Write an enzyme that holds these catalytic residues in place. Sequence first.
Site, PDB file in Angstrom:
ATOM      1  N   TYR B  90      32.230  16.548 -94.462  1.00  7.14           N
ATOM      2  CA  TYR B  90      30.796  16.517 -94.161  1.00  7.14           C
ATOM      3  C   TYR B  90      30.361  17.881 -93.616  1.00  7.14           C
ATOM      4  O   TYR B  90      30.984  18.895 -93.934  1.00  7.14           O
ATOM      5  CB  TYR B  90      30.543  15.413 -93.129  1.00  7.14           C
ATOM      6  CG  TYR B  90      29.130  14.875 -93.031  1.00  7.14           C
ATOM      7  CD1 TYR B  90      28.495  14.311 -94.134  1.00  7.14           C
ATOM      8  CD2 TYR B  90      28.459  14.862 -91.812  1.00  7.14           C
ATOM      9  CE1 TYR B  90      27.230  13.744 -94.021  1.00  7.14           C
ATOM     10  CE2 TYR B  90      27.199  14.302 -91.690  1.00  7.14           C
ATOM     11  CZ  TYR B  90      26.587  13.745 -92.795  1.00  7.14           C
ATOM     12  OH  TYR B  90      25.326  13.203 -92.670  1.00  7.14           O
ATOM     13  N   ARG B 143      16.408  20.289-101.431  1.00 11.83           N
ATOM     14  CA  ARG B 143      16.468  20.603-100.002  1.00 11.83           C
ATOM     15  C   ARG B 143      17.823  20.175 -99.431  1.00 11.83           C
ATOM     16  O   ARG B 143      17.917  19.199 -98.688  1.00 11.83           O
ATOM     17  CB  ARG B 143      15.322  19.879 -99.272  1.00 11.83           C
ATOM     18  CG  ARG B 143      14.942  20.469 -97.928  1.00 11.83           C
ATOM     19  CD  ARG B 143      16.004  20.212 -96.889  1.00 11.83           C
ATOM     20  NE  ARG B 143      15.879  18.886 -96.288  1.00 11.83           N
ATOM     21  CZ  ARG B 143      16.873  18.253 -95.677  1.00 11.83           C
ATOM     22  NH1 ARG B 143      18.071  18.815 -95.597  1.00 11.83           N
ATOM     23  NH2 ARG B 143      16.668  17.072 -95.121  1.00 11.83           N
ATOM     24  N   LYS B 161      28.008  11.997 -97.990  1.00 13.25           N
ATOM     25  CA  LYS B 161      27.422  10.824 -97.380  1.00 13.25           C
ATOM     26  C   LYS B 161      28.290   9.602 -97.669  1.00 13.25           C
ATOM     27  O   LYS B 161      28.770   8.923 -96.758  1.00 13.25           O
ATOM     28  CB  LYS B 161      26.015  10.608 -97.929  1.00 13.25           C
ATOM     29  CG  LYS B 161      25.054  11.733 -97.602  1.00 13.25           C
ATOM     30  CD  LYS B 161      24.718  11.783 -96.121  1.00 13.25           C
ATOM     31  CE  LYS B 161      23.906  13.026 -95.801  1.00 13.25           C
ATOM     32  NZ  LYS B 161      22.822  12.737 -94.814  1.00 13.25           N
ATOM     33  N   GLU B 233      18.340  11.281-100.427  1.00 12.35           N
ATOM     34  CA  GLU B 233      18.911  12.308 -99.573  1.00 12.35           C
ATOM     35  C   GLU B 233      18.559  13.692-100.090  1.00 12.35           C
ATOM     36  O   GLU B 233      18.609  13.951-101.291  1.00 12.35           O
ATOM     37  CB  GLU B 233      20.435  12.160 -99.519  1.00 12.35           C
ATOM     38  CG  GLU B 233      21.130  13.018 -98.474  1.00 12.35           C
ATOM     39  CD  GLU B 233      21.152  12.363 -97.107  1.00 12.35           C
ATOM     40  OE1 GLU B 233      21.776  11.288 -96.971  1.00 12.35           O
ATOM     41  OE2 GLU B 233      20.551  12.916 -96.163  1.00 12.35           O
ATOM     42  N   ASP B 234      18.196  14.564 -99.159  1.00 14.06           N
ATOM     43  CA  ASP B 234      17.858  15.945 -99.440  1.00 14.06           C
ATOM     44  C   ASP B 234      16.933  16.264-100.612  1.00 14.06           C
ATOM     45  O   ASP B 234      17.295  17.015-101.519  1.00 14.06           O
ATOM     46  CB  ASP B 234      19.150  16.748 -99.537  1.00 14.06           C
ATOM     47  CG  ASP B 234      19.878  16.784 -98.219  1.00 14.06           C
ATOM     48  OD1 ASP B 234      19.175  16.607 -97.202  1.00 14.06           O
ATOM     49  OD2 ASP B 234      21.110  16.989 -98.180  1.00 14.06           O
ATOM     50  N   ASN B 237      10.201  18.225 -99.148  1.00 14.10           N
ATOM     51  CA  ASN B 237       9.150  17.652 -98.311  1.00 14.10           C
ATOM     52  C   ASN B 237       8.252  16.660 -99.045  1.00 14.10           C
ATOM     53  O   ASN B 237       8.340  15.449 -98.844  1.00 14.10           O
ATOM     54  CB  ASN B 237       8.277  18.779 -97.756  1.00 14.10           C
ATOM     55  CG  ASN B 237       7.449  18.351 -96.567  1.00 14.10           C
ATOM     56  OD1 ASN B 237       7.912  18.412 -95.430  1.00 14.10           O
ATOM     57  ND2 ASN B 237       6.222  17.904 -96.820  1.00 14.10           N
ATOM     58  N   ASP B 256      17.186   8.954 -95.885  1.00 18.00           N
ATOM     59  CA  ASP B 256      18.054   9.368 -94.789  1.00 18.00           C
ATOM     60  C   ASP B 256      17.532  10.525 -93.922  1.00 18.00           C
ATOM     61  O   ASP B 256      17.673  10.497 -92.701  1.00 18.00           O
ATOM     62  CB  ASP B 256      19.439   9.711 -95.350  1.00 18.00           C
ATOM     63  CG  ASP B 256      20.477   9.933 -94.262  1.00 18.00           C
ATOM     64  OD1 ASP B 256      20.212   9.542 -93.108  1.00 18.00           O
ATOM     65  OD2 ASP B 256      21.560  10.488 -94.562  1.00 18.00           O
ATOM     66  N   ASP B 257      16.922  11.527 -94.552  1.00 19.53           N
ATOM     67  CA  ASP B 257      16.408  12.710 -93.854  1.00 19.53           C
ATOM     68  C   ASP B 257      15.201  12.459 -92.962  1.00 19.53           C
ATOM     69  O   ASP B 257      14.992  13.184 -91.994  1.00 19.53           O
ATOM     70  CB  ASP B 257      16.044  13.795 -94.867  1.00 19.53           C
ATOM     71  CG  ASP B 257      17.138  14.028 -95.889  1.00 19.53           C
ATOM     72  OD1 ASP B 257      18.171  14.634 -95.535  1.00 19.53           O
ATOM     73  OD2 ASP B 257      16.954  13.589 -97.051  1.00 19.53           O
ATOM     74  N   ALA B 290       7.945  20.866 -88.765  1.00 19.34           N
ATOM     75  CA  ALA B 290       7.016  19.753 -88.898  1.00 19.34           C
ATOM     76  C   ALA B 290       7.216  19.128 -90.263  1.00 19.34           C
ATOM     77  O   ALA B 290       6.252  18.734 -90.933  1.00 19.34           O
ATOM     78  CB  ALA B 290       5.588  20.234 -88.746  1.00 19.34           C
ATOM     79  N   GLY B 291       8.480  19.041 -90.669  1.00 19.99           N
ATOM     80  CA  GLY B 291       8.801  18.477 -91.964  1.00 19.99           C
ATOM     81  C   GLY B 291       9.333  17.060 -91.922  1.00 19.99           C
ATOM     82  O   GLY B 291       9.015  16.280 -91.021  1.00 19.99           O
ATOM     83  N   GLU B 292      10.147  16.735 -92.916  1.00 24.34           N
ATOM     84  CA  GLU B 292      10.744  15.417 -93.031  1.00 24.34           C
ATOM     85  C   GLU B 292      11.341  14.925 -91.721  1.00 24.34           C
ATOM     86  O   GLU B 292      10.993  13.856 -91.232  1.00 24.34           O
ATOM     87  CB  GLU B 292      11.837  15.433 -94.101  1.00 24.34           C
ATOM     88  CG  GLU B 292      11.335  15.501 -95.535  1.00 24.34           C
ATOM     89  CD  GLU B 292      12.452  15.799 -96.520  1.00 24.34           C
ATOM     90  OE1 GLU B 292      13.523  15.152 -96.427  1.00 24.34           O
ATOM     91  OE2 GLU B 292      12.262  16.676 -97.393  1.00 24.34           O
ATOM     92  N   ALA B 293      12.242  15.710 -91.154  1.00 24.65           N
ATOM     93  CA  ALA B 293      12.910  15.326 -89.925  1.00 24.65           C
ATOM     94  C   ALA B 293      11.935  15.189 -88.773  1.00 24.65           C
ATOM     95  O   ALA B 293      11.872  14.145 -88.118  1.00 24.65           O
ATOM     96  CB  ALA B 293      13.975  16.352 -89.578  1.00 24.65           C
ATOM     97  N   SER B 324       5.612  26.694 -90.142  1.00 26.56           N
ATOM     98  CA  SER B 324       5.658  28.088 -90.619  1.00 26.56           C
ATOM     99  C   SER B 324       4.451  28.919 -90.164  1.00 26.56           C
ATOM    100  O   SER B 324       4.565  30.125 -89.942  1.00 26.56           O
ATOM    101  CB  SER B 324       5.707  28.149 -92.153  1.00 26.56           C
ATOM    102  OG  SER B 324       6.480  27.107 -92.720  1.00 26.56           O
ATOM    103  N   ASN B 396      21.034  21.862 -89.889  1.00 27.66           N
ATOM    104  CA  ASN B 396      22.362  21.961 -90.500  1.00 27.66           C
ATOM    105  C   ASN B 396      22.368  22.927 -91.683  1.00 27.66           C
ATOM    106  O   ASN B 396      21.346  23.116 -92.353  1.00 27.66           O
ATOM    107  CB  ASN B 396      22.838  20.593 -90.990  1.00 27.66           C
ATOM    108  CG  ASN B 396      23.245  19.690 -89.864  1.00 27.66           C
ATOM    109  OD1 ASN B 396      23.981  20.099 -88.971  1.00 27.66           O
ATOM    110  ND2 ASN B 396      22.778  18.445 -89.900  1.00 27.66           N
TER     111      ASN B 396
END
Lengths: 555, 555, 555, 62
Positions: B90, B143, B161, B233-234, B237, B256-257, B290-293, B324, B396
């Site tokens: 991982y 992403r 994963k 996953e990944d 946006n 998941d993100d 200020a994205g997905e997470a 940004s 990460n």
Amino acid sequence: KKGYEVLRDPHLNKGMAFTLEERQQLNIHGLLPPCFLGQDAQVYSILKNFERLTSDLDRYILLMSLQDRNEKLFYKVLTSDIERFMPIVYTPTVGLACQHYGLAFRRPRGLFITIHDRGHIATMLQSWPESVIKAIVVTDGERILGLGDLGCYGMGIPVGKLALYTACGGVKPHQCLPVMLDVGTDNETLLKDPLYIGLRHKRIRGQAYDDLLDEFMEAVTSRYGMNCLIQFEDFANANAFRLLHKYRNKYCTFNDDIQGTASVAVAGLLAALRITKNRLSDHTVLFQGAGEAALGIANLIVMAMQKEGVSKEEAIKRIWMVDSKGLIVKGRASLTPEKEHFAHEHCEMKNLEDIVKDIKPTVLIGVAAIGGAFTQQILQDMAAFNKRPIIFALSNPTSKAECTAEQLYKYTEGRGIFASGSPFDPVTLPSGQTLYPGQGNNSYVFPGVALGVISCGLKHIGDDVFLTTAEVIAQEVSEENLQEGRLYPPLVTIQQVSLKIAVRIAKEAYRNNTASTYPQPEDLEAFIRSQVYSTDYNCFVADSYTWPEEAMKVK
Amino acid sequence: KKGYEVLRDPHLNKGMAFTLEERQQLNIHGLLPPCFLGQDAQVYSILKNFERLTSDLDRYILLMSLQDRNEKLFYKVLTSDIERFMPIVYTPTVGLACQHYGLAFRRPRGLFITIHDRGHIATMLQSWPESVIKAIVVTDGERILGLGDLGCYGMGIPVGKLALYTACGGVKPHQCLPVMLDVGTDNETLLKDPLYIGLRHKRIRGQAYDDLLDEFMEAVTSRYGMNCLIQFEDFANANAFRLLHKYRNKYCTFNDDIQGTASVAVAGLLAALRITKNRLSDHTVLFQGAGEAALGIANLIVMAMQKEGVSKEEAIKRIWMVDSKGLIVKGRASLTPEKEHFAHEHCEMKNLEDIVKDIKPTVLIGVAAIGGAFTQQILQDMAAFNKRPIIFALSNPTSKAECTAEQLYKYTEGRGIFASGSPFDPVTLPSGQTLYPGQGNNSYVFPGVALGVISCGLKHIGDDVFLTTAEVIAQEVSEENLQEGRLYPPLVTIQQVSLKIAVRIAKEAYRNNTASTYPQPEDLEAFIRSQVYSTDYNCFVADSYTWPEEAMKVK
Amino acid sequence: KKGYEVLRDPHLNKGMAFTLEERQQLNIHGLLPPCFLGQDAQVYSILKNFERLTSDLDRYILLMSLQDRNEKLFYKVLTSDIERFMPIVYTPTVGLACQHYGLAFRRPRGLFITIHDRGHIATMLQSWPESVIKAIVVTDGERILGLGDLGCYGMGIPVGKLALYTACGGVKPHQCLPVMLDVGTDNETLLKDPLYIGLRHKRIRGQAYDDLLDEFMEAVTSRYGMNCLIQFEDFANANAFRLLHKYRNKYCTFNDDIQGTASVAVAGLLAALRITKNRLSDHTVLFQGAGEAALGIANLIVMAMQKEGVSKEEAIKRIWMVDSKGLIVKGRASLTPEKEHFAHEHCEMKNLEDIVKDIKPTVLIGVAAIGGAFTQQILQDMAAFNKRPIIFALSNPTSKAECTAEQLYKYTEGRGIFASGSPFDPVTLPSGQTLYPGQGNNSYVFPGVALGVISCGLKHIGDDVFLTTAEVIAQEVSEENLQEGRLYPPLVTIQQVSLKIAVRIAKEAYRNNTASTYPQPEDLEAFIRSQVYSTDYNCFVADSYTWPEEAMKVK
Amino acid sequence: KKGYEVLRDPHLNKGMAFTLEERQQLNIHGLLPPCFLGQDAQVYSILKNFERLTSDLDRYIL
Ligand SMILES: NC(=O)c1ccc[n+]([C@@H]2O[C@H](COP(=O)([O-])OP(=O)(O)OC[C@H]3O[C@@H](n4cnc5c(N)ncnc54)[C@H](OP(=O)(O)O)[C@@H]3O)[C@@H](O)[C@H]2O)c1
Ligand SMILES: NC(=O)c1ccc[n+]([C@@H]2O[C@H](COP(=O)([O-])OP(=O)(O)OC[C@H]3O[C@@H](n4cnc5c(N)ncnc54)[C@H](OP(=O)(O)O)[C@@H]3O)[C@@H](O)[C@H]2O)c1
Ligand SMILES: NC(=O)c1ccc[n+]([C@@H]2O[C@H](COP(=O)([O-])OP(=O)(O)OC[C@H]3O[C@@H](n4cnc5c(N)ncnc54)[C@H](OP(=O)(O)O)[C@@H]3O)[C@@H](O)[C@H]2O)c1
Ligand SMILES: O=C([O-])C(=O)[O-]
Ligand SMILES: O=C([O-])C(=O)[O-]
Ligand SMILES: O=C([O-])C(=O)[O-]
Ligand SMILES: [Cl-]
Ligand SMILES: [Cl-]
Ligand SMILES: [Cl-]
Ligand SMILES: [Cl-]
Ligand SMILES: [Cl-]
Ligand SMILES: [Mn+2]
Ligand SMILES: [Mn+2]
Ligand SMILES: [Mn+2]
Ligand code: NA
Ligand code: NA
Ligand code: NA
Ligand code: NA
Ligand code: NA
């Protein structure tokens, strides 16, 4: 066959080289990334992976895995730069691999038959996927190169030998079977090694061993046919000879270490004669070692000498041998019937240098796995009694070479003629002249002999086959080669050399009616060339075609 | 099953662990060396192989090959020392692998569906050996971690994963399917990269992409059933959000993100409250990113606060974000509806340190993949206006971590509470006390959520599931853990935490009648425990037994 | 193999004869009723099923279905009462079957190669499960027995012939391949038949036809080896002779109708000489028909007479032939090079009876498929100028026999020596003596000839082989056999006769060095006996056994 | 899946209803006579086989 099962079968797997339409028809579309490439592209990727490694063992493991993943690509890479990859897949790296076989192990390869499987060999051959095998390289691992008893770790050798069967000889991979006969091991270190993969008990000898071997031979030829070629490799002295003698005339078999080495050894001396400007019968050969290689080589030299017109007796008088107890002389203690053949009237001696000074040979052959036995003194002495002494450091692997190309040329003032079992880089003398030391290794003999035997189905292999093969090899050494110090044709031409050896063996087979493949081909070279393996990928698309429309209509 | 094909099937392959009796009955006796060993012995050799390697990339390939050869062994090795091997399988190594996927590639894994396969997904699912799949992790590779668009090279992620699905969650490997949806890549570097394995063209966007996704979902649910779990996953946006909202209520899926991260982040804060001795409604959170997470975590935080007694409006006012363009304030330019949700009345700002000093938050969450965004200054400032500041370097892989454990603990005089997406070794403060920073990563949530959803057949996954899972994880953090600086239960206990997460989700599912597995188990824990994957090998001996004798007679 | 797949493979399927242990290990336990029985028990149920049938076509179908279900059981039944089942599986029922092949069809059998498949035969041979074929029986269906052009319906013949290869010869069923070469059919009735399974168009002739045949022979021998036995069966006259002549010396092939019939016919004459108490050179033969059978038999008889000392010319003078145009005489119109060979100076004649009265032959052989050609008048005439006339009604099937055993014996007043191609029941003369008319049918030759060629690998089959075979068969006719009116050994001993035929063919093959199997067995009879097919079931239990316990120890 | 194994599996087997293309891709071209028919043509031959029978047990077996 089809599906994901194809991608796991190295004989079928093309990897991403699989066409969009092949993938669709094989039911594997989606199991591979969306890119299609050719062998060249795939070879590129492999090389990037090979370049980044930092250990020969890791390079070995890399290639072994390739071999377990995509057969064609493996051989494509091997033949792409034979001089570069042979040292990894064959000597000297293969010995290093056998030393750590337990560690390097990933996916199993070959057929492991145990002394405990006696009476059940026939059944185990069923376990082997292929039902049509034409050649087999077997070992019991008691004499792995000059490394000793490596037991079951010895499987690395048969695998290596067969790699060249295909890479250097053109024999189809799928028809070959590497075999390990584990009857135990006397190597204390292995018995204690936690990674050892073989039977954890001393080697079983006697009648049990002998019956195992008889059953093996009987089982193999029953399943695969009497024409199946069985090549014994790296067996201990006693076993090697008795087994050869026992089956030589009953099956299609030969011992590589005894006969294959002799063939290449004589091939080099035959070539050397063009430099020393004399006859083979004018030489006086001294062997450091008196085992499989020495005795095999010595015998072929005698046959070669008789061919020149000398008598059997005169020929044997020009051959001297030294074993662990010293110079082999008449009436000496601890002598075998085979050694007694070369026991001449002479006082006893132990020191190798004194023996070289006393016998003053024209040819020094090292086949005792003794480190740097050919010291600067010995080498100087040879350069002293000979205008151009012939030096053969045949022990393998590299760490056992009687001496190096560098030292040979250095201590003989660049006048020594050199050859070794394991590879050495070119050497540029002080005069600026670059010499390219040749590799006196079985590798020049067994691939062609196999291509030959398999092609015409020679029932049994006589010693004349190896002498003739020794001549075919030497006949391929150009004047240009000779001027660079080469006693053998360059390695990159090994395939062409093998073909000639194969064609020549066939011609003789049919002539002496020992062949089995009939009717006889009008053109042997053309026939054998068409029997050789191909690096190219096959097409997995279904053979579709149309019928007239009337006949294809649905009622 | 049968013969050698068994040895090539990693799901079946037991290697030298196959008994003599098994090998004989499986027709593979002879295909494996003459030694039989247990898993411990097998894991030993694997470790001796892992130990000698000298690169993370290599250790990765080692493990990956293991997974392609022996399933049971692979997972036996991972759980044997989760803290040691997870970094390899991982984060962060998996990120390095993706970056060099082309190079690391050996045997393909997963299902690669292309944009050019629109209208044929149904058929492709058939090419997959398994017809019974309960979980699926998909990515389009736009992403990948904080590494950007890695196109098809992103396949490494779903594989990572899923590895944890099993190793951490206990989910059966054979029932999971990693999928890569390659519609191209906008990474100019990859497009020029000779090893690139994906489609060599810019990503296809618009309606073609949407149709591909709809088809995929349809295909997957028709074949595997509506209860099939689809884990996004990944993805980039924009796509991540709309896809989530588009299928959220129609199929059993989650992102998941956005949701998994939110869950683990909240789990950590919930735990931290027991150090800061206050309520979540007492904090002020600042998000770098200020994205997905960020948006996901913020949303869960809000829910958690409301559950405390605070109002929706009041909760939102406690969350600040920086993108940004800078601090997200009301009436600022370049704002998305989702971002304007946290836009407070305030003057525009861009400097991060000045933003920290102006908002003076109690919690700092980094999710913008900005190298060392949390500088000495920031960290000192935080330790200045906060008795015990909560710092989350969640980006990460490691190279993107807003800051290190060493840095946080040093520039906050040991008063900072740390957590990060990627692993960091224990830190021993000048006081002599050693802190064990926890890992705020999805890995604590998706394994258990899958075990849960699969077990009870939860039709759809609402946000409540993740808030509940956050409470469950925090509930497993002991005082002892807290005293060491861990905001999460130790990783070595991750299987047990996943079990409790699964059990909890199940109970809720049956309560709200959103479960599908009936009749409902009397003991949900016992039921789930019995559904968990086992690392033990199965016995391949035929089930032989006798019938009386008169009934067994042959007439 | 394993699973239900085993039950569907007639070559493996043992039915309820599967041991409980076998069922458990093969994964079929439960797929078969709870009872286990022996072959005898199984045969019993087959016989019960055969007994209740009320039509020959239905008995055929029952047995064909048996063959498609359980191979060993099938041949176990055939050999349990050869005199009873041969008439069903062979002549005359097989002729009936062919005439209604479309109706009797259930599961396909054999290889169907079409003229529209030119250039793809090699591909089609792959479709065939077995890769190791040693014998093939081919037909294009243009001359099926005396029934004419039955096109694709003629597949029944090769299937029947091979049934006897095994039943009467002892040749392994799996090593044999029945082939139908469909290039169309000129039979108007079949073209209109809605049940016809072949190509619905007139036969293709000329170069296209000849190319298909060349490609067939090349593909078959390329894949299966030059030693593969190719038996041509039921081809039209012109095609039969030229194909035989064209491949005779190139491949291992013979034409059953021309050469096999010749052998059996001479075999009968040789035996007859022991009743007529004279030499072959003393007879005068008259043939009703001048085709494949007639010319072939005529040729063998001549060779036989020369071996008595008579010159070729003198021998030919004793043989007369009649075709559709009448007696074959010198200068007669519509004569063939082959026929002209027996064109003697004599006035033309068309009426058979008149011809019989004129030539006054001692041997009357019928091979024209003309109903009851041998009328009472003709039979009386023969018994008038011959103390003991030899009458051979060789045409098949029974409805085409020149005359019946009853008629022959009745109108020759019990003095006529009879033999027919199709079976006739014993006849009890007015004197009370019972005669057992022998069956002069290829069935006495091809089985043993095949067992012989395959065993020693005779490269090509010259006429000498058939002549000697005729002698081998006549040698097996005892004094008792002759006294009963038998010109051939009893059918029940046909397997023993075939063996003798094979051992003799082998002996001569090695003597003339035309054999291929080497080394040569020391005991040919013992070798061949060991190669014969066994009706007994094999044991499908895994070969289980143990090793010492320390070597079996699991680490 | 493919090969003659398909002809033996009644769930897959189409008999002579297999198309020339199907046969070529299934690796069974040549194992079936050179005739292609629809289901109804197949039904017709079943009926002819049924008709000629003269026992219910036989019709059952068919
Ligand atoms: N193509 C090639 O290049 C090729 C092919 C085959 C083999 N080889 C190499 O040849 C070497 C030996 O192979 P082999 O088959 O001949 O083995 P072998 O049968 O065991 O012979 C080894 C011989 O060396 C003798 N020896 C040991 N110590 C000695 C010492 N201190 N001084 C003098 N002689 C000594 C032994 O003497 P005793 O008789 O007293 O035991 C024995 O006769 C190996 O390193 C192998 O790799 C090379
Ligand atoms: N469990 C875990 O530890 C976990 C889980 C999921 C994700 N993550 C990590 O979170 C990171 C981002 O993931 P994501 O899905 O949120 O990605 P994303 O959708 O691309 O969002 C990135 C956000 O960071 C903002 N940003 C970029 N540069 C910035 C800068 N220089 N200063 C301030 N803000 C900046 C972007 O702003 P604009 O909107 O203005 O473009 C965007 O809102 C990744 O590195 C990933 O590894 C960790
Ligand atoms: N082992 C056995 O017992 C065995 C083996 C093979 C064949 N047979 C039988 O022999 C018969 C012929 O087969 P074949 O292969 O020899 O076929 P063929 O080559 O077509 O020969 C048939 C011959 O009979 C001639 N003929 C037709 N009507 C005649 C008539 N009314 N009177 C006199 N002669 C007439 C034909 O004459 P034209 O040349 O003028 O047309 C032709 O020469 C078949 O019924 C077959 O069943 C038996
Ligand atoms: O034995 C050896 O060393 C060889 O064959 O190379
Ligand atoms: O995106 C990530 O980095 C993750 O999910 O861990
Ligand atoms: O064709 C025939 O009649 C035969 O082969 O018996
Ligand atoms: Cl590839
Ligand atoms: Cl009937
Ligand atoms: Cl009829
Ligand atoms: Cl009889
Ligand atoms: Cl039996
Ligand atoms: Mn060797
Ligand atoms: Mn992620
Ligand atoms: Mn015939
Ligand atoms: Na009956
Ligand atoms: Na049939
Ligand atoms: Na010939
Ligand atoms: Na005549
Ligand atoms: Na059909």
